Design a protein around this ligand. Structure first.
Ligand SMILES: O=C(O)CNC(=O)c1ncc2c(I)cccc2c1O
Ligand SMILES: [Fe+2]
Length: 216
């Protein structure tokens, strides 16, 4: 339970060895459900974008859109538990600093709340930071209660380094995931056939971000 124990006994060794780390039952049912209620309220009050344009070849009404997003700072009214999650992620990273590779984390992005609408859209294979923009660690929190991939799809498939086999991660309720943001972890989201929510924050390495400024 103690953030420092989780960090030192699991996250750090797992990340340095696999570059990926999954933590289940991170905040508990109560808090996880509260975060779910907050994200759902954001959706129901129209705070999300309409979704990534998947197919344009169509004509306005025929357009297909995918993942919808909304940026959350964490202090907005109705988003405080999301803020609590962010602070909890920050706490783990703080306890890991100086131990995640040779990176020195000194900041992060706001939270990106994503919603795959369940219309069969996913996210194409990609690398979060392929050009050295400063991001070294991707942190994702999932909040989909009773998610069954064999039925609803939406698996996050990561292809670690240049190894043959890949890793499938179900977007399970109260699951926390960390992985290196660079080319070591290309990944994709398989088609989702039910509403799928995730909250992502990216952590910056001090040196990479300092020189990224000279790239604009
Ligand atoms: O949701 C997951 O399990 C994994 N998603 C992603 O990798 C992922 N990566 C980058 C993203 C961007 I630049 C913008 C919207 C959504 C998004 C994503 O959803
Ligand atoms: Fe990604």
């Amino acid at each position: 339970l103690p953030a420092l124990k989780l960090a030192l006994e699991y996250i750090v060794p797992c990340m340095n060895k696999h570059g990926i780390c999954v933590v289940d039952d991170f905040l508990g049912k109560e808090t996880g459900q509260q975060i779910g209620d907050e994200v759902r309220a954001l959706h129901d009050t129209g705070k999300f974008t309409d979704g990534q344009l998947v197919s344009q070849k169509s004509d306005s009404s025929k357009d297909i859109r995918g993942d919808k997003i909304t940026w959350i700072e964490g202090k907005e009214p109705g988003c405080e538990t999301i803020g609590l999650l962010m602070s909890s992620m920050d706490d783990l990273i703080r306890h890991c600093n100086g131990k995640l590779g040779s990176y020195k984390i000194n900041g992060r992005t706001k939270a990106m709340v994503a919603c795959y609408p369940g219309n069969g859209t996913g996210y194409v294979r990609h690398v979060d930071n392929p050009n050295g923009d400063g991001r070294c660690v991707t942190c994702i929190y999932y909040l989909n209660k009773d998610w069954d991939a064999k039925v609803s799809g939406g698996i996050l498939r990561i292809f670690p380094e240049g190894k043959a086999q890949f890793a499938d991660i179900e977007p399970k309720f109260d699951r926390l995931l960390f992985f290196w943001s660079d080319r070591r972890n290309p990944h994709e989201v398989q088609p989702a056939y039910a509403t799928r929510y995730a909250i992502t924050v990216w952590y910056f390495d001090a040196d990479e971000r300092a020189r990224a400024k000279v790239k604009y």
